[PDB]
Short mmCIF file of C-alpha atoms in Angstrom, two decimals:
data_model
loop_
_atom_site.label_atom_id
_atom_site.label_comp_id
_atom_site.label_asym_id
_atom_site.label_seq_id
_atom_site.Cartn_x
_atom_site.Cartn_y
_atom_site.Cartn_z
CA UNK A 1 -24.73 -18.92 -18.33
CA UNK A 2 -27.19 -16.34 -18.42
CA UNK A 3 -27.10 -13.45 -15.89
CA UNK A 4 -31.25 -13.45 -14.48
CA UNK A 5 -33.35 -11.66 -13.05
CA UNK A 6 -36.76 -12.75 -11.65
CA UNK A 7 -40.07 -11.13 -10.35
CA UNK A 8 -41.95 -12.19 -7.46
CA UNK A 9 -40.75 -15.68 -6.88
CA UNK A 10 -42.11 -17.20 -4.40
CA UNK A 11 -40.30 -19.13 -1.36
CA UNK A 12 -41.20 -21.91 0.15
CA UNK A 13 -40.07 -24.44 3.08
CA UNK A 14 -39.89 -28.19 3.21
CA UNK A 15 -40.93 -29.66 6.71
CA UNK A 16 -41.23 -33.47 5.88
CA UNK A 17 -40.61 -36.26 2.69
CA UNK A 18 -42.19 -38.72 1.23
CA UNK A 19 -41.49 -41.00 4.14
CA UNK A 20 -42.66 -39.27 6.79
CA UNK A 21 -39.24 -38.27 8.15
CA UNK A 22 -38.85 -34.57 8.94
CA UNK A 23 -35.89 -32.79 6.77
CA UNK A 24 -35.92 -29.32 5.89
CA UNK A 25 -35.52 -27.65 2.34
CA UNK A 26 -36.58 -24.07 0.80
CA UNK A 27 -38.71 -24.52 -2.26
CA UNK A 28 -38.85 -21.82 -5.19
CA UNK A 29 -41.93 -21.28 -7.28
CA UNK A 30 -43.36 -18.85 -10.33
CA UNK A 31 -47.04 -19.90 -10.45
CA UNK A 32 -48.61 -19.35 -13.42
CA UNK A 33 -50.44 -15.86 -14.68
CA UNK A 34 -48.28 -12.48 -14.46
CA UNK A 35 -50.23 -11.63 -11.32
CA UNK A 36 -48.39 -10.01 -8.62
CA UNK A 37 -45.94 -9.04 -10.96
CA UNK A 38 -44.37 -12.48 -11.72
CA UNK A 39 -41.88 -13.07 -14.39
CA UNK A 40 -38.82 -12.96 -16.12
CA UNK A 41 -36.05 -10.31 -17.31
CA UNK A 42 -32.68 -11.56 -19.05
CA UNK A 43 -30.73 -9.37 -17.87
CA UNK A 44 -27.61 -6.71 -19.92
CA UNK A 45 -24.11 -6.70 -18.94
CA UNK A 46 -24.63 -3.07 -19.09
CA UNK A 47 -25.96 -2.51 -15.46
CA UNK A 48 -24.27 -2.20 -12.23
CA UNK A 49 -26.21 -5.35 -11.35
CA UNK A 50 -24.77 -7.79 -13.74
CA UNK A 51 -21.28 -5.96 -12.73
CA UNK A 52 -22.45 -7.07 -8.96
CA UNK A 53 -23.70 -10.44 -9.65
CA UNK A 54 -20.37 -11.35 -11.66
CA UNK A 55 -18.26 -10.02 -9.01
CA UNK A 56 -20.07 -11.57 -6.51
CA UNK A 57 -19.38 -14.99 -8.31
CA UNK A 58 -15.87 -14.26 -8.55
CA UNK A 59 -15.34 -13.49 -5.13
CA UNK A 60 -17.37 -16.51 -4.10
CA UNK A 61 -15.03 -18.10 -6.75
CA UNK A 62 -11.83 -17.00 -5.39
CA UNK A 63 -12.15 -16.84 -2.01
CA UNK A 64 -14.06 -20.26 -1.37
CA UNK A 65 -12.65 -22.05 1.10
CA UNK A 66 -14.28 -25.47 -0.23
CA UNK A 67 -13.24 -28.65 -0.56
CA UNK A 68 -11.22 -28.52 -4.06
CA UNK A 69 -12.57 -30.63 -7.00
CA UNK A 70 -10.87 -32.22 -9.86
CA UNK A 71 -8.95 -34.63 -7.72
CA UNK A 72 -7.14 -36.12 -10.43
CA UNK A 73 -4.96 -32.72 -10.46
CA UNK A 74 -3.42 -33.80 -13.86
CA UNK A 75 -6.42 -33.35 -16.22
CA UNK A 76 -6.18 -29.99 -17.46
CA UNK A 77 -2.85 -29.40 -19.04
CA UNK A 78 -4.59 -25.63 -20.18
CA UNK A 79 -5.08 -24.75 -23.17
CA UNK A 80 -3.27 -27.74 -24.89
CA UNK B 1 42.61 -9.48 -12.26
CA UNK B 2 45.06 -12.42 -13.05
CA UNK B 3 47.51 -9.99 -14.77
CA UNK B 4 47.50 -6.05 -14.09
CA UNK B 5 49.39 -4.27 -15.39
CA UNK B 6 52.81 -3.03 -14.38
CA UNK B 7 54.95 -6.36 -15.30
CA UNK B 8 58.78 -5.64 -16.35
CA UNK B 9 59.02 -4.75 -20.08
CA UNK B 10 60.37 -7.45 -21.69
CA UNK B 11 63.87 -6.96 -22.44
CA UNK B 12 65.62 -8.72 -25.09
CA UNK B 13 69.00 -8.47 -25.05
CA UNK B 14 68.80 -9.40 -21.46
CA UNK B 15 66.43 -12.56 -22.37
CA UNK B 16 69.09 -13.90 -24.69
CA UNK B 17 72.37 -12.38 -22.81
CA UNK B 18 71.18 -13.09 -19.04
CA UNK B 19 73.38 -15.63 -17.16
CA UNK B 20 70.37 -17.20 -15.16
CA UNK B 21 67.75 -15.64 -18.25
CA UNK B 22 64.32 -14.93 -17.29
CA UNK B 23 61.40 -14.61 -19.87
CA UNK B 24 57.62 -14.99 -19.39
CA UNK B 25 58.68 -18.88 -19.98
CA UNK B 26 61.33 -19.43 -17.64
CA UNK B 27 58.97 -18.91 -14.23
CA UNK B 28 55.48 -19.43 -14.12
CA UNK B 29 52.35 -20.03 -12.23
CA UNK B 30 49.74 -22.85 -13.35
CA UNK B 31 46.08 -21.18 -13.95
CA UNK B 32 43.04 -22.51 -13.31
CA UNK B 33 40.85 -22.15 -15.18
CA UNK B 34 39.30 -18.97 -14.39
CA UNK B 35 35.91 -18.56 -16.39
CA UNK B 36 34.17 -19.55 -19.22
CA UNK B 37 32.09 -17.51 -21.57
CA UNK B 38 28.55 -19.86 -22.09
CA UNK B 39 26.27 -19.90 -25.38
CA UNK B 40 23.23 -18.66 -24.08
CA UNK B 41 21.39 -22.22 -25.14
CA UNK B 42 23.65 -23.80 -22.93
CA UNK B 43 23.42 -21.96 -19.91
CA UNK B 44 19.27 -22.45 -20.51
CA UNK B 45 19.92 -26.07 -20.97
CA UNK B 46 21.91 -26.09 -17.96
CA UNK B 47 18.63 -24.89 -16.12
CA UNK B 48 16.33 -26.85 -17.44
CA UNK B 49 18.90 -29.98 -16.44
CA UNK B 50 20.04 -29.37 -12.54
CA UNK B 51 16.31 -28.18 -12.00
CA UNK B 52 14.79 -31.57 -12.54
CA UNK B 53 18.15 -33.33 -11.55
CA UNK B 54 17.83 -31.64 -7.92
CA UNK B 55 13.77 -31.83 -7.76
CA UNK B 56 12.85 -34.31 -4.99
CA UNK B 57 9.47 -34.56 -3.46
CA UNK B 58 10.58 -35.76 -0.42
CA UNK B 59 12.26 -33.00 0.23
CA UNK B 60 9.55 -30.26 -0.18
CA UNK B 61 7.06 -32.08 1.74
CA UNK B 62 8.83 -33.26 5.08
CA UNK B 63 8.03 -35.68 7.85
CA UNK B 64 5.74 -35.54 9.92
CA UNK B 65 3.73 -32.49 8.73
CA UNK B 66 3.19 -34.29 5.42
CA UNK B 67 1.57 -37.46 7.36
CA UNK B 68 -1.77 -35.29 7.45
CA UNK B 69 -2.71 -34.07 4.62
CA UNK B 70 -5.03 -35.47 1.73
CA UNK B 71 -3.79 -36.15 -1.33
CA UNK B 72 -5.39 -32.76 -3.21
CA UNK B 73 -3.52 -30.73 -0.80
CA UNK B 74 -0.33 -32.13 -1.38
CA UNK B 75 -0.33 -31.91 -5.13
CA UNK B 76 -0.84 -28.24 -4.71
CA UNK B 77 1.50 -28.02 -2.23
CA UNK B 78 3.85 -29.57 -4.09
CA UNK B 79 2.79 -28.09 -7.69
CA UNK B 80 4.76 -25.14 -7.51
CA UNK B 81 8.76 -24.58 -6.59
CA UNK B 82 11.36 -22.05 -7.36
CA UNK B 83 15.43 -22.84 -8.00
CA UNK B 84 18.22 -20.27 -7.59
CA UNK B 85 21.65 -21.48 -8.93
CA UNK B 86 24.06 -18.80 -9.16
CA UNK B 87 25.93 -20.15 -11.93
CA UNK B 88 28.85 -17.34 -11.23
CA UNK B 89 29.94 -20.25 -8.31
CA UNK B 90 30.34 -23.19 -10.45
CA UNK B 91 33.83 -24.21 -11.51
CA UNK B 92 35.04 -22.70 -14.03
CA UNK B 93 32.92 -19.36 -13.37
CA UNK B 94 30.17 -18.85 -16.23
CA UNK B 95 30.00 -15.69 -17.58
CA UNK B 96 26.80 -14.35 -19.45
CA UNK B 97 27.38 -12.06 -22.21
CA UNK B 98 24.75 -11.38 -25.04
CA UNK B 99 23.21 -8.64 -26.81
CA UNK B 100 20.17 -6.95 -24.98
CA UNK B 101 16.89 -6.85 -27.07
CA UNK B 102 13.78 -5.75 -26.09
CA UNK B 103 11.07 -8.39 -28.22
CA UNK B 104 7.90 -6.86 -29.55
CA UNK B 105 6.04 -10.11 -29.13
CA UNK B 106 6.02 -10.25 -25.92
CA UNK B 107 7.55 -6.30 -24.29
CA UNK B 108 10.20 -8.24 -22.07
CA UNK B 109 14.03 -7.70 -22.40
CA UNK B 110 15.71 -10.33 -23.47
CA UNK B 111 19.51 -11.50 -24.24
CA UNK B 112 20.12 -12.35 -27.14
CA UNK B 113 23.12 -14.37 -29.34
CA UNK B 114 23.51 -16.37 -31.99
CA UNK B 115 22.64 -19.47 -30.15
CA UNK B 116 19.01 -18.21 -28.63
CA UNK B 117 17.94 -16.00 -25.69
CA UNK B 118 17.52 -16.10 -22.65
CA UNK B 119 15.05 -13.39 -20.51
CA UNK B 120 16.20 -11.32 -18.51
CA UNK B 121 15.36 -8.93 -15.45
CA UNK B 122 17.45 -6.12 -15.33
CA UNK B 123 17.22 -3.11 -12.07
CA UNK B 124 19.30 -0.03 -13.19
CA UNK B 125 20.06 0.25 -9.13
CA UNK B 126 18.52 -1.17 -6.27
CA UNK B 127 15.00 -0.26 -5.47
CA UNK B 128 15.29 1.55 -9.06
CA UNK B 129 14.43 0.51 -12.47
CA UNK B 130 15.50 0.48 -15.90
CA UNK B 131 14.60 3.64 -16.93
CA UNK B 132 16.27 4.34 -20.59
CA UNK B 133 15.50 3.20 -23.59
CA UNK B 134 18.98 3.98 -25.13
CA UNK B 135 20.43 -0.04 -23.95
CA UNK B 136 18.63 -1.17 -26.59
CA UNK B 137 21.96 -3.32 -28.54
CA UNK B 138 24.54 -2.62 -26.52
CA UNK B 139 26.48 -5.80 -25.53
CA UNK B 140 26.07 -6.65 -21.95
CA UNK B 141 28.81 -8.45 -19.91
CA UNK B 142 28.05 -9.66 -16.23
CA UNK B 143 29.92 -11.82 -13.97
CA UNK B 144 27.89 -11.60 -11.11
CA UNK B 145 24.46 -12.71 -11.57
CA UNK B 146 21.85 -14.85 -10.48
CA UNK B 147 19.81 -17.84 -12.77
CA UNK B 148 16.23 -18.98 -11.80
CA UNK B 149 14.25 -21.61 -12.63
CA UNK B 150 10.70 -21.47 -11.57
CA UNK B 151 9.11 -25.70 -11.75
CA UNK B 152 5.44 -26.06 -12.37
CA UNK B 153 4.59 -29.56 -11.79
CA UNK B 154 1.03 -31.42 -12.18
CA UNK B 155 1.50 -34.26 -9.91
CA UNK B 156 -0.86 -36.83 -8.71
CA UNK B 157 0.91 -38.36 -5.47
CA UNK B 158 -1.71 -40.35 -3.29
CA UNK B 159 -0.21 -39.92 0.37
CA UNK B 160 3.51 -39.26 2.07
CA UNK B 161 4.15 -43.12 1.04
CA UNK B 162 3.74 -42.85 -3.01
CA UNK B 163 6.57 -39.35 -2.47
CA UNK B 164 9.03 -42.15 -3.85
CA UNK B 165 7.38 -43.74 -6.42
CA UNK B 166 7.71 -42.15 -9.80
CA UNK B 167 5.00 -43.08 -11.91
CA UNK B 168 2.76 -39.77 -10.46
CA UNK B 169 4.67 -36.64 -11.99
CA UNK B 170 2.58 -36.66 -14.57
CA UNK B 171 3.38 -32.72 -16.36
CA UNK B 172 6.91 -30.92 -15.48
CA UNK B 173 7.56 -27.50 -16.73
CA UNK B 174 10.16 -24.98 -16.24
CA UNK B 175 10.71 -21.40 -16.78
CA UNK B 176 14.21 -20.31 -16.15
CA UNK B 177 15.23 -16.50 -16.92
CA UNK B 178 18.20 -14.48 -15.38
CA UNK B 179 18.39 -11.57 -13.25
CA UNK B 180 20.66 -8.94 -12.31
CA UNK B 181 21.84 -5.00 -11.46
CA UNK B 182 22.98 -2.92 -14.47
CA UNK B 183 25.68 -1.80 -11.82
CA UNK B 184 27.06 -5.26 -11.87
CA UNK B 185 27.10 -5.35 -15.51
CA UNK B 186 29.79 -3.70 -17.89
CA UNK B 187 27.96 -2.72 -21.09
CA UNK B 188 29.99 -2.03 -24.45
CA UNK B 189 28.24 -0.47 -27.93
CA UNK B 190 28.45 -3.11 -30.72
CA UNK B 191 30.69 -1.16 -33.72
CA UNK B 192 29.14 -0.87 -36.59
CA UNK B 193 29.91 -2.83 -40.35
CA UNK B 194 33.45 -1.60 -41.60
CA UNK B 195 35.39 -2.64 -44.45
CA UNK B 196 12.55 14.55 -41.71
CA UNK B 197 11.67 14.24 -37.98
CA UNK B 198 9.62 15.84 -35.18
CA UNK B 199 9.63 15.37 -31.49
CA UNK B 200 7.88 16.50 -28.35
CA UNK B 201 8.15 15.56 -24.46
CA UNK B 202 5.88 14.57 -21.91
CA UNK B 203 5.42 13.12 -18.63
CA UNK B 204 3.19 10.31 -17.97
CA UNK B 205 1.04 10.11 -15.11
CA UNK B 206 0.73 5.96 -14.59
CA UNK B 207 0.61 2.89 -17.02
CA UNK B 208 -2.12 0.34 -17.39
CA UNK B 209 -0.92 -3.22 -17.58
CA UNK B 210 0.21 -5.23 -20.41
CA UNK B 211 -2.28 -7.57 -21.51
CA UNK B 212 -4.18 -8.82 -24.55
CA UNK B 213 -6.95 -6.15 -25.54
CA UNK B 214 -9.51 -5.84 -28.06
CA UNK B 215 -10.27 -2.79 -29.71
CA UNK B 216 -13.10 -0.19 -31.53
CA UNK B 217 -14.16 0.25 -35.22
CA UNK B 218 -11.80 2.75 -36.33
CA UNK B 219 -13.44 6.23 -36.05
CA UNK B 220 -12.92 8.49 -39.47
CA UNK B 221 -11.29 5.37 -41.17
CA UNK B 222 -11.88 2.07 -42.77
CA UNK B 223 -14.07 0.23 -40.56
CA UNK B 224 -11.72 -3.20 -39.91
CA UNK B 225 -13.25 -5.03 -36.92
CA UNK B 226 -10.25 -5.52 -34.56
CA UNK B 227 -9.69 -8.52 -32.43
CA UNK B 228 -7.25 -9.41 -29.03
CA UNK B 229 -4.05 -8.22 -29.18
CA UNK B 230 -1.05 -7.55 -27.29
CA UNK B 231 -0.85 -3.86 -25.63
CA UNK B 232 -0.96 -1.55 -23.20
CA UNK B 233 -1.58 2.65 -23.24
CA UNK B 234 -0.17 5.52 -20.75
CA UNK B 235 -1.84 8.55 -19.11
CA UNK B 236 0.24 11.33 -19.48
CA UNK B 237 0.70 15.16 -19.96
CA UNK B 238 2.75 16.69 -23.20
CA UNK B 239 5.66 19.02 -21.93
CA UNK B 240 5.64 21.83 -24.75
CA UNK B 241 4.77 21.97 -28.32
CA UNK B 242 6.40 19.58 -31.22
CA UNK B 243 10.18 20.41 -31.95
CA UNK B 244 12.23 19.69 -35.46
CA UNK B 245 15.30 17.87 -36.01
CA UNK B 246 17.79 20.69 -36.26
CA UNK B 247 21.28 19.22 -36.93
CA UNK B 248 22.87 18.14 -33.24
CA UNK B 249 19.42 18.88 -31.74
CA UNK B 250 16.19 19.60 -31.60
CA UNK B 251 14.73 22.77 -32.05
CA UNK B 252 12.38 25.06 -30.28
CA UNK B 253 8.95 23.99 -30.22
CA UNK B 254 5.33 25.41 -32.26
CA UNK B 255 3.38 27.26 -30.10
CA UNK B 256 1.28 25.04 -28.50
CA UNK B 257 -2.22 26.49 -26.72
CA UNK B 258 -1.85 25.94 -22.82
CA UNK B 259 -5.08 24.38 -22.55
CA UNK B 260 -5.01 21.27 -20.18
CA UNK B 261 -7.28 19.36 -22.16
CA UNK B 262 -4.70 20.08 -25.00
CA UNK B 263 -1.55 18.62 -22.77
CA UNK B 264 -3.18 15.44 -21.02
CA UNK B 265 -3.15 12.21 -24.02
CA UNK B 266 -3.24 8.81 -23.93
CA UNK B 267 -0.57 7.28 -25.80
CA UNK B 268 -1.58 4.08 -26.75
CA UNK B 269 0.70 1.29 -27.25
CA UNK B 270 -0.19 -2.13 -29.50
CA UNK B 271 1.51 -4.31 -32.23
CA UNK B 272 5.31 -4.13 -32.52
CA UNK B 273 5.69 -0.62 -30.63
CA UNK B 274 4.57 -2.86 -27.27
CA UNK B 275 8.53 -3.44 -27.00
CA UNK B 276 8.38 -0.22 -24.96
CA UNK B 277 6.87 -1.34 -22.13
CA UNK B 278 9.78 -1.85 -19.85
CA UNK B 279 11.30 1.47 -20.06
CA UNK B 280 8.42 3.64 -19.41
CA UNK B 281 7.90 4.50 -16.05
CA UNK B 282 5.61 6.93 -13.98
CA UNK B 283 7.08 10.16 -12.58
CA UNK B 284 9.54 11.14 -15.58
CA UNK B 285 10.20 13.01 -19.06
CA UNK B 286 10.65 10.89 -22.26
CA UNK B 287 11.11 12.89 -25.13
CA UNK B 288 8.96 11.03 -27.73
CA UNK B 289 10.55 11.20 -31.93
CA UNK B 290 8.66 10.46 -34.53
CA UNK B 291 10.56 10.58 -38.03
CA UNK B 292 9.42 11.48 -41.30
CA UNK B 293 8.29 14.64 -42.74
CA UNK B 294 6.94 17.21 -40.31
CA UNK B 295 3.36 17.47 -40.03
CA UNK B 296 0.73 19.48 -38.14
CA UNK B 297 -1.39 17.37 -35.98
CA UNK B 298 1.00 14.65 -35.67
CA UNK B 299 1.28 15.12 -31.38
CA UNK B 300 -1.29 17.88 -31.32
CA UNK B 301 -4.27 14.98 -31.37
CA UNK B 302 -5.18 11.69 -33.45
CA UNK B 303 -8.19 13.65 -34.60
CA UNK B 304 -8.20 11.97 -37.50
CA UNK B 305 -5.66 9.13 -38.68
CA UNK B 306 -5.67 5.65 -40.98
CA UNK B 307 -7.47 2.49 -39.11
CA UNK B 308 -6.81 4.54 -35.82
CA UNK B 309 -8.00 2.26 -33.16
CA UNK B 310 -8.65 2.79 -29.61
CA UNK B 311 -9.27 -0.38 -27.01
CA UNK B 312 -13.08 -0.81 -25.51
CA UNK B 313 -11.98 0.94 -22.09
CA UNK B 314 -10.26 3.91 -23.72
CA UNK B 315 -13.09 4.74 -26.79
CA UNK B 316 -13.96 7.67 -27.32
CA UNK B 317 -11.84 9.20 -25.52
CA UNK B 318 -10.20 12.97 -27.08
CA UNK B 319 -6.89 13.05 -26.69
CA UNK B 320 -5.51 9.26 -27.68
CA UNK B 321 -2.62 8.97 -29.58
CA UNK B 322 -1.75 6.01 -31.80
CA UNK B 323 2.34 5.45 -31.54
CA UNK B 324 3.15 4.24 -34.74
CA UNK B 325 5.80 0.99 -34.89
CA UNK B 326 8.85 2.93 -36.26
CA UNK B 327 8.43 5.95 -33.71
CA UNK B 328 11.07 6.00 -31.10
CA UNK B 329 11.19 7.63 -27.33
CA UNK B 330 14.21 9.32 -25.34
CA UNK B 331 14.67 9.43 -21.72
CA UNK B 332 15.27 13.38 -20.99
CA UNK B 333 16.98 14.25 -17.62
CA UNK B 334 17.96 17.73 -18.19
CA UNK B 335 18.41 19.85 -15.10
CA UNK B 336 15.66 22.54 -16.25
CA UNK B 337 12.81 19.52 -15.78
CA UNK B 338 14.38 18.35 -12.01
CA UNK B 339 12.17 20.33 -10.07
CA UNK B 340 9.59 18.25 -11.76
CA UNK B 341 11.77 15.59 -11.30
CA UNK B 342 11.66 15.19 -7.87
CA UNK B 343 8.75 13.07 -7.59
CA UNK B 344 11.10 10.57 -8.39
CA UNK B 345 13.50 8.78 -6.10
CA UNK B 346 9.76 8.09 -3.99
CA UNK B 347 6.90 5.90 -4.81
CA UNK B 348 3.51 6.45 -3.75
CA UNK B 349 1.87 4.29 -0.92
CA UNK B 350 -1.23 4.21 0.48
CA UNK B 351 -1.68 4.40 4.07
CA UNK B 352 -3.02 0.71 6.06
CA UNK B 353 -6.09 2.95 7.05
CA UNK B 354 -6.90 2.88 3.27
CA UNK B 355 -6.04 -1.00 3.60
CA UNK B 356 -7.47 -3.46 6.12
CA UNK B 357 -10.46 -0.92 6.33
CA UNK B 358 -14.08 -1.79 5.83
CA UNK B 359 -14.61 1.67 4.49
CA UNK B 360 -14.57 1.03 0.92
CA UNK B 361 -14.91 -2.25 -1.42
CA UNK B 362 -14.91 -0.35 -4.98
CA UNK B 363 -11.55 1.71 -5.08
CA UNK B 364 -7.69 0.54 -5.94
CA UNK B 365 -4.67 0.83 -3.77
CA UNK B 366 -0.69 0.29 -4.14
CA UNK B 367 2.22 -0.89 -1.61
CA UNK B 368 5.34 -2.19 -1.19
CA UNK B 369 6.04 -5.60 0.28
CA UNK B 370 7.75 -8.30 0.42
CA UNK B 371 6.79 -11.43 -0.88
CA UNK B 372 6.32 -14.46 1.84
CA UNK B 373 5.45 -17.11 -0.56
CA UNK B 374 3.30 -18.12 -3.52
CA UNK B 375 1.40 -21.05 -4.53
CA UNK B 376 -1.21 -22.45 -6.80
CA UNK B 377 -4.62 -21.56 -6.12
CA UNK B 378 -7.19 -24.35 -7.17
CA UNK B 379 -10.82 -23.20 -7.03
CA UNK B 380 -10.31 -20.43 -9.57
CA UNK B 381 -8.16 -22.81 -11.73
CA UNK B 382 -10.55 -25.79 -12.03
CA UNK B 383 -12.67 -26.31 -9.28
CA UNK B 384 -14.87 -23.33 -10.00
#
């Protein structure tokens, strides 16, 4: 559940699979060696940009629109 | 009502000399039976019984609308449903009487008797609420009032065919409280058994919202590392310096330096003084009393007091103000603070330019409205 930050990660897009059918998917890679500025940075609940990444994911959270999950709408029962 | 007065003085040499006597035997009318006075476990019970008794399924979701809809949308459609009951028209005619509490575990009034209690939601007037803190123990009798029971259910119906099965309700809770005007209630002071202060006044600018808080490592005090608790603080602005009991009243206040910074405080309300919550409200004077021997910086500023504590969004803060759980407030109407007064009687609304506007994702608004409906809402309560 960390909140992430990442340097220079490169993107990358899928054209075809291992059976020679053509489907599409965008690949994400950080190649080895800091070069280009790659890397890592776990990031503080401190900055503006946690605050925005959190309420980002809440408001992606709250107003979904998806398919709800949990079909068996009895599990919960809260904290019991 | 079934007897004013006014009847004939009873007479009796005339009700043992009369040729055809008459006495309050001799003609009479048979009574129903007007009303009933209900222990308030019964009248919950009562609730709690009809609600379930009257719950039907079938009902809620209707045909043919319901024939569409999968089976996750229909438990939430169906997982939330409201019950109004007006006991007042039931035969005989309940009447609720109790003693009104407000309970520091929790800041909400209740009514209270020897059998239980039962919440409550009084409104001093419509479109106005309860706005003095001096009800607290006064008997309240009311004859016209409303009883509603709010169902949360958990259900786990398939389709519109398994609505009359009833193997599927799976959870049922309820959550019945009462509600009524102050105007339509006759209040009475409880007698009593039969056989050294300072205060100030202040008017507070808004109040944050009651909810469980954690707080700082006291500052100038023993360090004891809080944890959540129940409270809530005010903005407000102090209205003169502190005043002394003085007999009947309360006398003129130490001079107090006119400094803003010196009138704007925080008062911050946790632990058992949280049963003041429902009184306080924006836009008016309370006169704040704290007993006990008087004391310099007592209202002037915390500055400095035992395990003071102020909550993560508030530290640091200058002027906060611990109330302590035996201090009491006043609602203060005199005419000389009116012209201050008349923010009241008016609310304060943003304009729908301020709403429904792209110009601004990071600032708060408030509005009146009426409420269309409510329901459960599933992706913040499990899905996601």
């Amino acid at each position: 559940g960390s909140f992430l930050r990442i340097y220079s990660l490169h993107t990358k897009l899928q054209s075809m699979n291992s059976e020679n059918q053509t489907m599409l998917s965008l690949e994400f890679h950080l190649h080895g060696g800091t070069s280009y500025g790659r890397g890592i940075r776990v990031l503080p609940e401190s900055n503006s940009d946690v605050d925005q990444l959190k309420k980002d994911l809440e408001s992606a959270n709250l107003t979904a629109n998806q398919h709800s999950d949990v079909i068996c709408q009895s599990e919960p029962d809260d904290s019991f | 009502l079934l007897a004013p007065p006014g009847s004939p003085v009873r007479n009796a040499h005339n009700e043992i000399l009369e040729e055809p006597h008459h006495c309050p035997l001799q003609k009479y009318t048979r009574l129903q039976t007007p009303s009933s006075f209900p222990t308030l476990a019964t009248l919950k019970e009562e609730g709690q019984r009809k609600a379930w008794a009257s719950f039907d399924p079938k009902a809620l979701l209707p045909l043919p609308e319901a024939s569409y809809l999968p089976s996750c949308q229909l438990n939430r459609r169906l997982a939330w449903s409201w019950l109004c009951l007006l006991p007042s028209a039931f035969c005989p005619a309940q009447v609720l009487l109790g003693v009104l509490v407000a309970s520091s575990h929790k800041g909400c009034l209740q009514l209270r008797d020897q059998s239980g209690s039962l919440p409550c939601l009084l409104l001093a007037k419509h479109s106005q609420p309860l706005s003095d803190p001096r009800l607290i123990g006064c008997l309240v009798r009311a004859e016209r009032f409303q009883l509603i029971v709010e169902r949360d259910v958990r259900s786990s119906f398939p389709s519109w065919k398994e609505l009359s099965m009833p193997g599927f309700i799976q959870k049922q809770q309820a959550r019945v409280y009462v509600q009524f005007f102050l105007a339509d209630a006759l209040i009475l002071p409880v007698p009593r058994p039969c056989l050294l202060g300072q205060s100030r006044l202040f008017l507070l600018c808004h109040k944050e919202a009651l909810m469980k808080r954690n707080f700082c490592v006291p500052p100038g005090a023993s360090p004891e590392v809080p944890k959540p608790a129940l409270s809530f603080y005010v903005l407000g602005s102090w209205l003169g310096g502190t005043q002394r009991k003085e007999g009947t009243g309360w006398g003129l206040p130490e001079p107090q330096g006119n400094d803003d910074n010196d009138q704007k405080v925080h008062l911050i309300f946790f632990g058992s003084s949280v049963r003041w919550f429902e009184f306080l409200h924006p836009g008016q004077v309370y006169r704040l009393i704290a007993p006990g021997p008087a004391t310099p910086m007592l209202f002037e500023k915390d500055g400095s007091s035992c395990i003071s504590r102020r909550p993560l969004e508030l530290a640091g803060c200058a002027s906060c103000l611990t109330v302590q759980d035996n201090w009491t407030l006043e609602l203060e109407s005199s005419q000389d603070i009116q012209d201050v007064l008349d923010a009241n009687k008016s609310l304060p609304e943003s304009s729908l330019t301020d709403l429904l506007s792209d110009n601004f994702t990071d600032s708060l608004v408030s509005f009146s409205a009426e409420i269309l409906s409510r329901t459960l809402c599933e992706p913040l309560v499990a899905s996601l």
